[PDB]
Every structure is written in structure tokens, then in C-alpha cells.
């Protein structure tokens, strides 16, 4: 859920996912259309596609557990869903971290009306 994902984002980026990444570009939020604004936004686009490939799960709601071994996030075995959701979140949190050098404040509080056109996963 947003609880676990938010925790990873803070640990990896040092920034509170909300409000830092909850209104970023076209894909970091609830939106889901248009061309991603930058690398960070693409991380969210990819995260959405990952979640979109978990039809048999409830990404945003399902709770899962994870640990950190040797400074890295480790998704332990739970239900198939918990494991997959964890992996989607892990990949995105790290993606955010890897691209912090191009995180742009100008893309915060981005209005969805500027985002249109379905982009294929």
C-alpha cells in the first residue's frame, strides 16, 4: 500500500513521498496520460505499468512486509501479490533515487489537464 511504498521512497530519496512525489508530472499521482515530463515522471509511468500487470491484486491497498539487508531493499516471501507489489514499489523507489539529479521542482503540483493521450506500456 501507499504506507509501504512511501516508506521506501523516504529511505531511498530522503524525501517524503507525499507531497514530494504525489503531484509530480503526469504520472506521479492518480493521473495516467500524456508523455512523461522527465526521468522521475517516467519512473511513475513504469510503476503504473507494473501495477497494471497485477490484475489479481490490490496494489494500493494490500499491505506487505519488507526488510533491508546490506543497505538494500529486500522483498521477502509472503503471498504472490505481496511479493510482486513489493517489487514494483522497490523498483520505483530506486528509480526515484537514481534520478534525483534531474528532479525538477517545476513539475510539482502539475495540472493533469496538461497531460493527455494514452501511452502504451
Amino acid at each position: 500500500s501507499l504506507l509501504e511504498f512511501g516508506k521506501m521512497i523516504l529511505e531511498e530519496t530522503g524525501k517524503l513521498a507525499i507531497p514530494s512525489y504525489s503531484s509530480y508530472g503526469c504520472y506521479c499521482g492518480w493521473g495516467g496520460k500524456g508523455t512523461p515530463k522527465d526521468a522521475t515522471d517516467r519512473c511513475c509511468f513504469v510503476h503504473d505499468c507494473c501495477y497494471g500487470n497485477l490484475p489479481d491484486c490490490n496494489p494500493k491497498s494490500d499491505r506487505y512486509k519488507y526488510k533491508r539487508v546490506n543497505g538494500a531493499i529486500v522483498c521477502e516471501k509472503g503471498t504472490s501479490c505481496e511479493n510482486r507489489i513489493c517489487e514494483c514499489d522497490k523498483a520505483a523507489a530506486i528509480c526515484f533515487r537514481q534520478n534525483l539529479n534531474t528532479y525538477s521542482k517545476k513539475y510539482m503540483l502539475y495540472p493533469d489537464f496538461l497531460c493527455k493521450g494514452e501511452l502504451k506500456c
Partner: peptide, 5 residues
């Protein structure tokens, strides 16, 4: 305990 999307 804090990410959307």
C-alpha cells in the same frame, strides 16, 4: 508511510 501512484 507516504507514497501515492
Amino acid at each position: 508511510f507516504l507514497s501515492y501512484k
